[PDB]
Design a protein around this nucleic acid. Structure first.
Length: 68
DNA sequence: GCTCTAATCCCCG
DNA sequence: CGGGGATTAGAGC
């Protein structure tokens, strides 16, 4: 990683990220360009957030597995 | 340095 | 090409 954490989030980036996510729950170039302009963050951080969001979701649900 | 955890390097499909 | 499993490495305490 030659220079990780070239960015640091806040509640305002999570507020954008989540509200433009709702309109396209998977990334593409257009989803990623549009969020990059609005958050005022690189297109690489948008990917890295969508990825981190799925991991946080499915981690917390696996810790709450059930059975029948 | 431990801790927080978003970011990093290889794989899945 | 992004999801993403498992681990690395910078921001904060």
């Amino acid at each position: 990683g030659p220079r990780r954490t070239r960015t640091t989030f806040t509640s305002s980036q999570i507020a954008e990220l989540e509200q433009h996510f709702l309109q396209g729950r998977y990334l593409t170039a257009p989803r990623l360009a549009d969020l990059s302009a609005k958050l005022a963050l690189g297109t690489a951080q948008v990917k890295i957030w969508f990825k981190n969001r799925r991991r946080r979701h499915k981690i917390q649900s696996d810790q709450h597995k059930d059975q029948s």
